[PDB]
Each structure stands twice: as structure tokens, then as C-alpha cells.
PDB file of C-alpha atoms in Angstrom:
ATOM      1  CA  UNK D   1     -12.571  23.916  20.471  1.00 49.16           C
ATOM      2  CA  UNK D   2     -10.472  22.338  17.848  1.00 49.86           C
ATOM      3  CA  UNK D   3      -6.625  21.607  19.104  1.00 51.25           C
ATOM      4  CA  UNK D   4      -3.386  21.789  17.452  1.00 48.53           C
ATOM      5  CA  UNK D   5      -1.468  18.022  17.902  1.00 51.43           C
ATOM      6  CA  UNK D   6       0.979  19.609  20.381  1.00 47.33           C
ATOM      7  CA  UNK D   7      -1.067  21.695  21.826  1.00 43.30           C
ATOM      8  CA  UNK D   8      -3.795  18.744  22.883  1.00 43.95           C
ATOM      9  CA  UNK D   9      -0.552  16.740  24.009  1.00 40.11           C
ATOM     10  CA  UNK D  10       0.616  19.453  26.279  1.00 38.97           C
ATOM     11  CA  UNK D  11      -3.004  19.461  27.450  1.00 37.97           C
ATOM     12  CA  UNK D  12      -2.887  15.721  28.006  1.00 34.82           C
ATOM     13  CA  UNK D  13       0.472  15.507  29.712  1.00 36.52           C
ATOM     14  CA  UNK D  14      -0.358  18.235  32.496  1.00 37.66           C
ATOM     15  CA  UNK D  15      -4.229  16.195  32.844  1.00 36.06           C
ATOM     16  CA  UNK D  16      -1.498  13.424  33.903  1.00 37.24           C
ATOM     17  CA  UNK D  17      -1.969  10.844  30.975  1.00 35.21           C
ATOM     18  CA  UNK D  18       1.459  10.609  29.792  1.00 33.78           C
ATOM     19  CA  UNK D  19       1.728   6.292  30.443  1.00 30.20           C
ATOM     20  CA  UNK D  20      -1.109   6.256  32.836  1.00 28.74           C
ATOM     21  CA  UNK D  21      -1.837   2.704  33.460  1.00 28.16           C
ATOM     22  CA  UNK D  22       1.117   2.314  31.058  1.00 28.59           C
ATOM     23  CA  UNK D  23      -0.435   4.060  27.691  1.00 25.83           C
ATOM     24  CA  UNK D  24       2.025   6.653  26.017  1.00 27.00           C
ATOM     25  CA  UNK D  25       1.067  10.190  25.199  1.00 26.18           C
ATOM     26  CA  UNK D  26       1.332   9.624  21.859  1.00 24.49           C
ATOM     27  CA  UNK D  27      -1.179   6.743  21.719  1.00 23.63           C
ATOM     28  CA  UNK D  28      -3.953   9.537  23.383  1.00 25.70           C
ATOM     29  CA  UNK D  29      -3.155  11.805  20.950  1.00 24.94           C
ATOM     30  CA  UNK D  30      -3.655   9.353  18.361  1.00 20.15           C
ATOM     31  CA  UNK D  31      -6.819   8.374  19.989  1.00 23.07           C
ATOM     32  CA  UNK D  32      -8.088  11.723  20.219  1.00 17.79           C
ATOM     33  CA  UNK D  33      -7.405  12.617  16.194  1.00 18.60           C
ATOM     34  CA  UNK D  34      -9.322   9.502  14.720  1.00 19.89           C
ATOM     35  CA  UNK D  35     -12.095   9.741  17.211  1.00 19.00           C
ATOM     36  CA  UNK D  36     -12.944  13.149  17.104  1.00 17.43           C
ATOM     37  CA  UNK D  37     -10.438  15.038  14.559  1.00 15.74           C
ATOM     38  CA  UNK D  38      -9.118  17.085  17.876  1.00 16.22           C
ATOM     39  CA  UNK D  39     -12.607  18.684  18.105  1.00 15.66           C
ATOM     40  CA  UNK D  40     -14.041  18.960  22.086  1.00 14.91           C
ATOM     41  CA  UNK D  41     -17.268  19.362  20.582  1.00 13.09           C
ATOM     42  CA  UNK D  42     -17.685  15.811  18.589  1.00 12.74           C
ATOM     43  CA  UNK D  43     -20.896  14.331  18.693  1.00 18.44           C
ATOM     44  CA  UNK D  44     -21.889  11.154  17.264  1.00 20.71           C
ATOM     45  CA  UNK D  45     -25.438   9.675  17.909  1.00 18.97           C
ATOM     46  CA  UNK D  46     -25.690   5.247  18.051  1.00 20.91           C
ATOM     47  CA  UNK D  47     -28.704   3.242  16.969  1.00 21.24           C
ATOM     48  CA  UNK D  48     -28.885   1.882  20.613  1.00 23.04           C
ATOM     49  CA  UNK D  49     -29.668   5.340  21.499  1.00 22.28           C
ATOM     50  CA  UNK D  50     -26.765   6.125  23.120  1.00 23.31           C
ATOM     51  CA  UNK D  51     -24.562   9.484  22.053  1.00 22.76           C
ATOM     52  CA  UNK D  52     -20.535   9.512  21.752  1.00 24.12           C
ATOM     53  CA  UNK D  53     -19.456  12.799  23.046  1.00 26.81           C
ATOM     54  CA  UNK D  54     -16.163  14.981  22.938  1.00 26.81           C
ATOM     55  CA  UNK D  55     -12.371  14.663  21.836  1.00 25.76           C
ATOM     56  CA  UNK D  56     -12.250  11.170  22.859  1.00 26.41           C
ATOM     57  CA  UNK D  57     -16.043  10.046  21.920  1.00 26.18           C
ATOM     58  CA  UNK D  58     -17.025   8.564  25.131  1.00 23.91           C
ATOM     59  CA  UNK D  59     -20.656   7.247  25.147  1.00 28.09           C
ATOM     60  CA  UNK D  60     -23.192   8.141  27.298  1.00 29.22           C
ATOM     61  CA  UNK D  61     -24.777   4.144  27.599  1.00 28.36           C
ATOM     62  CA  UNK D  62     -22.440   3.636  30.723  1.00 28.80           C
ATOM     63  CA  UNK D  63     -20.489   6.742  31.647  1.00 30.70           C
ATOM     64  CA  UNK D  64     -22.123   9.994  31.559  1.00 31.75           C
ATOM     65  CA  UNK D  65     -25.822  11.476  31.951  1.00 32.21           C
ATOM     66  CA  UNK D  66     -27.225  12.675  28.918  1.00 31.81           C
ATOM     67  CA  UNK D  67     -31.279  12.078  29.997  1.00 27.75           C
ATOM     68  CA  UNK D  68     -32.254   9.673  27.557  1.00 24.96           C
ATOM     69  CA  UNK D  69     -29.601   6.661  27.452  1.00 24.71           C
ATOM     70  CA  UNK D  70     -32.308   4.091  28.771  1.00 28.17           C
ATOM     71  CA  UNK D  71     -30.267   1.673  31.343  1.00 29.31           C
ATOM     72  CA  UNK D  72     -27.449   4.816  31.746  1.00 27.63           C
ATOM     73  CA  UNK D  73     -25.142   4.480  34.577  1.00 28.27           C
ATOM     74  CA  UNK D  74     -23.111   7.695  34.220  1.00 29.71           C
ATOM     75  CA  UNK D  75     -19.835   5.838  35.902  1.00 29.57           C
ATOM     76  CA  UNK D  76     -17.601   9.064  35.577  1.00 24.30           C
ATOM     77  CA  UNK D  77     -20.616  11.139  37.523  1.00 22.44           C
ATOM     78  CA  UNK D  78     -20.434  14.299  34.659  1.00 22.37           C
ATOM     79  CA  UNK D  79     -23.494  15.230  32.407  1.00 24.16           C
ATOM     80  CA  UNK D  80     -22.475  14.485  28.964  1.00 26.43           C
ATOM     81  CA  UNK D  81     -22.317  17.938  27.879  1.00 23.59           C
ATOM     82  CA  UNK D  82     -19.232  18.270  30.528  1.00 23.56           C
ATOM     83  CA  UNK D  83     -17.613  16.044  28.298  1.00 26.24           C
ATOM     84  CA  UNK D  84     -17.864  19.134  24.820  1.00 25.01           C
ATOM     85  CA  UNK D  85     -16.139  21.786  27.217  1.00 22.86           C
ATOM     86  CA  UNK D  86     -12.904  23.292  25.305  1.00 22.38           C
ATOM     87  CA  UNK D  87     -11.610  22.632  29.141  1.00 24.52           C
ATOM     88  CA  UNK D  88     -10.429  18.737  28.662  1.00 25.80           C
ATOM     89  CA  UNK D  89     -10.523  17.869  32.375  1.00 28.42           C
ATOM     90  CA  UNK D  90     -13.482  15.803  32.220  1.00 29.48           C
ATOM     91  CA  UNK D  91     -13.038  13.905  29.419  1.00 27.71           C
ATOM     92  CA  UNK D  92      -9.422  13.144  30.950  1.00 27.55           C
ATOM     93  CA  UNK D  93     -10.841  11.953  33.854  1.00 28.89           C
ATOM     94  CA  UNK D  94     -13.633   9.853  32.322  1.00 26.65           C
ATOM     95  CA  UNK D  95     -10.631   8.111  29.971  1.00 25.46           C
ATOM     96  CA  UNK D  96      -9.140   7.162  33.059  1.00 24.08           C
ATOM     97  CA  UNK D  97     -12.009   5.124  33.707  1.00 24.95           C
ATOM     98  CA  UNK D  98     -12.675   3.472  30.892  1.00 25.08           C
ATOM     99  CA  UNK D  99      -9.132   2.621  30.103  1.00 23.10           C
ATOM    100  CA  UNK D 100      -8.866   0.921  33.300  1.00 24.51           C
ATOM    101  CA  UNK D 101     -12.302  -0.961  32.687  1.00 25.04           C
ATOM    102  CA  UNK D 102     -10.642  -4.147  31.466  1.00 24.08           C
ATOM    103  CA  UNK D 103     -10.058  -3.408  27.954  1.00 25.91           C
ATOM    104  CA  UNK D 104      -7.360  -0.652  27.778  1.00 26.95           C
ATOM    105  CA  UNK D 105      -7.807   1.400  24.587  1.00 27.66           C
ATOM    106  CA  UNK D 106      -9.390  -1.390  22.714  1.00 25.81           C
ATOM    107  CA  UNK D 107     -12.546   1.100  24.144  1.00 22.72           C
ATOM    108  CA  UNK D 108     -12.129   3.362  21.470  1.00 21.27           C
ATOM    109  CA  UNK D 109     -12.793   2.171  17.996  1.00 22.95           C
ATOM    110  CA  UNK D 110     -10.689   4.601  16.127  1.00 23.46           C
ATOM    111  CA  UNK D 111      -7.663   3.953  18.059  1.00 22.80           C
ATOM    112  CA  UNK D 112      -8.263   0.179  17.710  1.00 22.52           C
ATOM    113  CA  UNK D 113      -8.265   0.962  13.827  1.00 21.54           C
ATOM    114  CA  UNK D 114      -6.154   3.969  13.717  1.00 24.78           C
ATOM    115  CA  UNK D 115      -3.398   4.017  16.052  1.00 24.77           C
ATOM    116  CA  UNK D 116      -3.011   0.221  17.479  1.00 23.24           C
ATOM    117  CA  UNK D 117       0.105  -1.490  16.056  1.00 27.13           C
ATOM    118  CA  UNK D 118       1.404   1.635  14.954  1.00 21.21           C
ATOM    119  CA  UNK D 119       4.188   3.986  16.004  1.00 17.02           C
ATOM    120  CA  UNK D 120       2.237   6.546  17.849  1.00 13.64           C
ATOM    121  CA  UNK D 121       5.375   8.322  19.021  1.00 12.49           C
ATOM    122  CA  UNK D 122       5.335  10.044  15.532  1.00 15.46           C
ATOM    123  CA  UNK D 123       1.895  11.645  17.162  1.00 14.58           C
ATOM    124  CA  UNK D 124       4.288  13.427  19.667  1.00 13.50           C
ATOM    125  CA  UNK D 125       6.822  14.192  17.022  1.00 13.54           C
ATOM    126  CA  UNK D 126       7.985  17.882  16.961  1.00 13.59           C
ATOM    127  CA  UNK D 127       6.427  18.722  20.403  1.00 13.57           C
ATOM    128  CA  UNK D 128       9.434  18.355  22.515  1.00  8.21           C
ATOM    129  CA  UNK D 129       7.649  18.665  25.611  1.00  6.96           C
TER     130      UNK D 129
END
């Protein structure tokens, strides 16, 4: 599924990720339109033979079971492919962890370049929520 800003925001906010563990709404958005362009289904295979999956490209080397990660740990306990549902709940869930691994959203590479230092409110702009 492919979600409208506002829409994946309203999403977000009932999921409970408005400031959890102190990150805005507007930086999730954010993170959610570099890494995957809004799209649940985003896939992006690594040379370490790991595979980034869903709206917020989490990779399957320490938190979900894809099969053939070798040393894979799935730490959110989902298969991957729960992760490409148009139903966000388990990616939400699986954010929570890794944001609260000990690097914050410095675990998602388009947000570091994207969204970090920026005004991310303006992600939230117009959805008066």
C-alpha cells in the first residue's frame, strides 16, 4: 500500500508513536518517506545478505525472520513479510524496538540523511490531527 503523508501520520499517531521515547510524529513520517517513499511493500536486498523490508526498511540481520539472514535473531518475533502488510502494526512495533536499541533514529539511514537537523514538523503540516 502506498500512503498519503497525513494519512500514514494518522496511522502512526493511533500505533502510539507520536514522541515515543521522545521522537515527534513528524520525524516518523519523515523517516518513513525517505526510507521507503510511503510504500508498505519496500524491499531492498544488502550485500551481507540481509533484506530491508517495509515503510520503515527494517532489516532482517537482527529483527525479523526472513529464512536466509545467516546469524538472524528476529528480535521483534514477526516473519519479515509481516513487516510488507498495508496493516502498519508490525512495523510500528518493530520501530519501537529499534529506536530504543541505543541509537534512536540514527537506525535508519534515510532519516539520518533526510530528516535529522531538519524541521520535520513541516512533515505534519496540513494534517491537523
Amino acid at each position: 500500500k502506498v500512503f498519503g503523508r497525513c494519512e500514514l501520520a494518522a496511522a502512526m499517531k493511533r500505533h502510539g508513536l507520536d514522541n515515543y521515547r521522545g521522537y515527534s510524529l513528524g520525524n516518523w513520517v519523515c523517516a518513513a518517506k525517505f526510507e521507503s517513499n510511503f510504500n508498505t511493500q519496500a524491499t531492498n536486498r544488502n550485500t551481507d545478505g540481509s533484506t530491508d523490508y517495509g515503510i520503515l526498511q527494517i532489516n532482517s540481520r537482527w529483527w525479523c525472520n526472513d529464512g536466509r539472514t545467516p546469524g538472524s535473531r528476529n528480535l521483534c518475533n514477526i516473519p519479515c513479510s509481516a513487516l510488507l502488510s498495508s496493516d502498519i502494526t508490525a512495523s510500528v512495533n518493530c520501530a519501537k524496538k529499534i529506536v530504543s536499541d541505543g541509537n534512536g533514529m540514527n537506525a535508519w539511514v534515510a532519516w539520518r540523511n533526510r530528516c535529522k537537523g531538519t524541521d520535520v514538523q513541516a512533515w505534519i503540516r496540513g494534517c491537523r490531527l
